[PDB]
Design an enzyme around this catalytic site. Structure first.
Site, PDB file in Angstrom:
ATOM      1  N   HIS A   1      11.944  10.165 -31.336  1.00  0.00           N
ATOM      2  CA  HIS A   1      12.186  10.754 -32.680  1.00  0.00           C
ATOM      3  C   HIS A   1      11.573  12.148 -32.803  1.00  0.00           C
ATOM      4  CE1 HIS A   1       8.038   9.939 -34.154  1.00  0.00           C
ATOM      5  NE2 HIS A   1       8.123   8.921 -33.288  1.00  0.00           N
ATOM      6  N   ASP A   2      12.353  13.085 -33.311  1.00  0.00           N
ATOM      7  CA  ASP A   2      11.891  14.403 -33.827  1.00  0.00           C
ATOM      8  C   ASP A   2      11.748  15.402 -32.683  1.00  0.00           C
ATOM      9  OD1 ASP A   2      11.626  14.036 -36.805  1.00  0.00           O
ATOM     10  OD2 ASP A   2      10.306  12.363 -35.982  1.00  0.00           O
TER      11      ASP A   2
ATOM     12  N   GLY B   1       7.546  11.661 -28.939  1.00  0.00           N
ATOM     13  CA  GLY B   1       7.871  12.047 -30.331  1.00  0.00           C
ATOM     14  C   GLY B   1       7.456  13.468 -30.682  1.00  0.00           C
TER      15      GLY B   1
END
Ligand SMILES: N#Cc1ccc(CN(Cc2c[nH]cn2)C(=O)CSc2ccccc2Cl)cc1
Ligand SMILES: N#Cc1ccc(CN(Cc2c[nH]cn2)C(=O)CSc2ccccc2Cl)cc1
Ligand SMILES: N#Cc1ccc(CN(Cc2c[nH]cn2)C(=O)CSc2ccccc2Cl)cc1
Ligand SMILES: [Cl-]
Ligand SMILES: [Cl-]
Ligand SMILES: [Cl-]
Ligand SMILES: [Cl-]
Ligand SMILES: [Cl-]
Ligand SMILES: [Cl-]
Lengths: 258, 258, 258
Positions: free
Chosen positions: B121-122, B139
Site C-alpha cells: 500500500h501507498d 508500504g
C-alpha cells in the site's frame, strides 16, 4: 448473490455450514469441513482431512491442507485445524500434520497470515498472531498468542515463538524466541522487548518496566540461562507478564547432566 | 483470437479500452479501468478502484488492486494507478493505498516487476525500474527511475530507493538508498555506486567520476551527512547527475533541532 | 474419471502420452511434450517448447516453461527439459533458456522442488536434489546430484552447487559451493560437510573421515585454493568421494596469468 459458485468443485464428502461462500474455480476436497460465515475466495485449493471454523476469509491461490512434501511423510491420514476469524491472504500454503508429531497442524483464532506465508506440517499457531508476507514455519513450529513475524521471517523446525514476541523483516530464527522479545537478522539475535505490543494490550507501566528488567537479566548481565531463570523467580512471582517470559525460556532449555 | 476470454469475469462497472486482452479465469473487478493494448493473462485477479494504462502485460496468479491486510486500513475507497508499458510477472501482489498517506499506490511506465514481488500500500514507483523476483516494498516506499532491486530485496515502510540505485540479492533495506548507490546484506550497507547503469544511460566520463567522488564525500571521509551535503554543493551545481545524488541524501535527513 | 479434465486447455501441438492426467483450468501451451504417467494439477501453466518426462507431479499455480523476463532474452525458440519422477510443488516458476548459454533449462530425475521455488533460465539440475520453498536460482545455475538447498536459499547466476552439498535457510550464495560442503548466511560461508548426506548414501566411514580432512585442507589451514588443490591429489586418488570434492574446487577457479 449466490454463496457457492457453480464453477467451484465441492467433494460430496466436504461439509459446509450453509452461509459459507466459495468463489469460482475453487476446489474443496474430500474430508474438508468449513464453518458458519467463512468466505473462500476464487482459485483456492482445500485438501483434507481439514476442519476450518467460522468467519475465516481465505484469499486466491492459497493451498490449505496439502500433504507436506517432506520425505518423512508417507501418506498417513493427518489433519489440519483452523479456528475462527482468521484471514489467510493470497497464495498462502498450509500443510497437514505428520504422524511422528501429533498428526495435526493447528491454527487458533483471529490470526492474520499474509500473502505467500507458509505454515509447515505440525506447526501450532495460537490466537491474534500476525505472520507478514512470506513468513515460513518449516515444521513443528509453535507460535504463541500476539506474536508478529515481520515479512520473510524464516523459522527452523521445532522452534517456539513466544507470546508478544516480534521478529524483524528477513529474520532467520534458529532457536526459541522468548515471549515479548524482539529479534533481527540471519541469524536471528535478540535486541529488546516489544514495548508496542505491551502498550496495545494496556499492560501496567510497572509490568512494562519489570519486563525491561527481565530482558536485562537474561541478555545484558552475563548470566548463563540457568542463572537468569533463578534471578527471574522473584519478578515471575510478582508479575504474570514476567512469568510468561520466565516460562518461555524454561521450556526451551532442559539440558543434559554435566 | 477473441480479446476478452468468455471464461473471464468482467464487472459491468469495469472500463476496458477497445483492444485489451483478458485471459481465461481472470477477474476484472468493479471500478477497474484498463488502457489500450494492455494484456491480462489467465488466472489474474484485478480489484479496484484501479486504473491500469496502456501496453501492460500482467501474468497469471497476480492479484493487483486488492486491499492491504494492514489493520490500519479500514475499507476506505483508496486507489491504485499503473502507467504504460509495465511488465508484471507471475504471482505479483500490488495493493491499493490507505487514507493515512495520499490514498494511492502509484506505478509509472516501463517497469519490470518479476515473479512474486509485492508492492505494498501507498508505494510510489517511477519509470524503468526492475523489481526482481520476490522484492517486497512493505508500504509507502518510493522507488525513483531506473532503480534495480535484486531478488528477495525487502524495503521497510517509508524508505526511498534513489534513481539508478541497486540492491543486491536478499538485501534488507531499512533506511533510504541514495541515487546510484549499491547496497547489500541484512541489514543493507552501501558498497559502491551503480556504474553499470551510468554506462547504460550513456553518462559522460566526467559525470561517472564526479559521482565516484561524491560517494567518497558521503561514505569514506568521516563527514556527517550535514558536512557531506555542504561539500557536494559544488559537484551538484556542475553535474545534474550529482545533484540527483545530493537531493536523494537531502530529503532523507531533515533532523531535529539539537 | 476423464484423465484430462475437460476444463483444461490443451494446444493441438502438445503431445501427451496416453495416461497423462491434467487437472481443471490447467493450460498445456504449444510445443509441450508430457511423458507417460505424469500428473498436472489444476491451475498449472505449461509453456514451450518444453519436454517433460515420465511420472512427474506438477502442483497448482506452477508456471513451467515461461520466457525469462531478463531483458537479454528476445523471444528466441529456447527450450526446457525435465526428466522423470520429479515433484514440482505449489507455485514453482521454471523458465526456458536463453541463446547466449545453451538455449536450454534442464532438470534430471527424482528432484523435489517445493513451493515458490524459482528455476531461472539456463539452470541445470541433476538428480535426487531438494530445493526447499522459495529457493531461487537466478540463472545459469548448475546443481549436481543430491544437493539440498534449504528454504529461501538464493543462488547468484553461474554458481555451481556441488553434489551432496547443503545450504542453510536464508543462504545467499554468490560463489561455487564445492561438493559435500555446508554453507550458511548472507553472504553464504562454509562451515562443515554434510556428513548426514554421506550416511544416507552409505559412504564408507574411511571416506567420511577423508572428506573431513579434505575440508580441513581447503578451509581450516592457510592454503590458497591452488595450494589446497595440490595437497588434495593423494586423497582424490584414494577416494572417489574426495575426487568429486577436488573436482568441484578445480572447476570453479580457472584464474588469470599473474
Ligand atoms: N497489520 C499489520 C502488520 C503488523 C506488523 C508488520 C511488521 N512490519 C512493519 C514493521 C517492522 N518493524 C517495524 N514495523 C513488517 O513486517 C515490515 S516487512 C513487510 C511488510 C509487508 C509486506 C512485506 C514485507 Cl517484507 C506488518 C504489518
Ligand atoms: N533484466 C533484468 C535483471 C536485472 C538485474 C538483476 C539483478 N540480478 C542479477 C545481478 C546481481 N548482481 C549483478 N547482477 C539479480 O537479482 C540476481 S538474484 C535473482 C534473479 C532472478 C530471480 C531470482 C533471483 Cl534471487 C536481475 C535481472
Ligand atoms: N524432504 C525434505 C527436506 C529436506 C531438507 C530440508 C532442509 N530444511 C530442514 C529440514 C530437515 N528435515 C526437515 N526439514 C529446511 O530447509 C528448513 S527451512 C524450510 C523448510 C520448509 C519450508 C520452508 C522453510 Cl524456510 C527440508 C525438507
Ligand atoms: Cl531500574
Ligand atoms: Cl543496559
Ligand atoms: Cl512525496
Ligand atoms: Cl580523483
Ligand atoms: Cl577511498
Ligand atoms: Cl586426522
Amino acid at each position: 448473490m449466490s454463496l457457492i459458485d457453480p464453477r467451484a468443485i465441492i467433494d460430496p464428502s466436504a461439509r459446509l455450514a450453509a452461509d459459507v461462500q466459495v468463489g469460482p474455480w475453487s476446489i474443496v476436497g474430500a474430508e474438508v469441513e468449513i464453518g458458519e460465515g467463512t468466505v473462500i475466495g476464487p482459485h483456492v485449493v482445500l485438501k483434507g482431512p481439514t476442519k476450518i471454523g467460522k468467519h475465516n476469509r481465505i484469499y486466491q491461490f492459497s493451498s490449505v491442507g496439502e500433504d507436506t512434501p517432506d520425505l518423512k511423510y508417507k501418506g498417513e491420514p493427518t489433519r489440519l485445524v483452523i479456528g475462527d476469524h482468521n484471514v489467510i491472504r493470497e497464495g498462502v500454503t498450509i500443510h497437514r500434520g505428520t504422524v511422528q508429531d501429533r498428526a495435526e497442524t493447528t491454527i487458533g483464532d483471529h490470526n492474520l497470515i499474509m500473502a505467500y506465508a507458509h505454515i509447515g506440517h505440525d506447526s501450532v499457531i495460537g490466537n491474534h498472531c500476525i505472520l507478514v508476507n512470506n513468513t515460513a514455519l518449516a515444521g513443528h513450529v509453535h507460535v504463541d498468542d500476539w506474536a508478529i513475524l515481520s515479512g520473510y521471517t524464516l523459522v527452523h523446525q521445532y522452534c517456539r515463538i513466544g507470546a508478544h514476541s516480534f521478529s524483524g523483516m528477513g529474520s532467520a530464527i534458529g532457536k526459541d524466541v522468548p515471549a515479548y522479545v524482539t529479534v533481527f537478522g540471519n541469524p536471528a539475535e535478540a535486541r529488546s522487548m516489544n514495548f508496542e505490543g505491551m502498550r496495545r494490550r494496556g499492560f501496567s507501566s510497572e509490568a512494562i518496566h519489570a519486563l525491561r528488567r527481565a530482558y536485562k537479566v537474561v541478555y545484558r548481565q552475563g548470566h548463563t540461562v540457568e542463572e537468569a531463570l533463578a534471578e527471574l523467580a522473584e519478578s515471575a512471582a510478582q508479575f504474570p507478564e514476567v512469568a510468561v517470559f520466565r516460562d518461555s525460556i524454561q521450556s526451551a532449555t532442559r539440558g543434559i547432566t554435566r
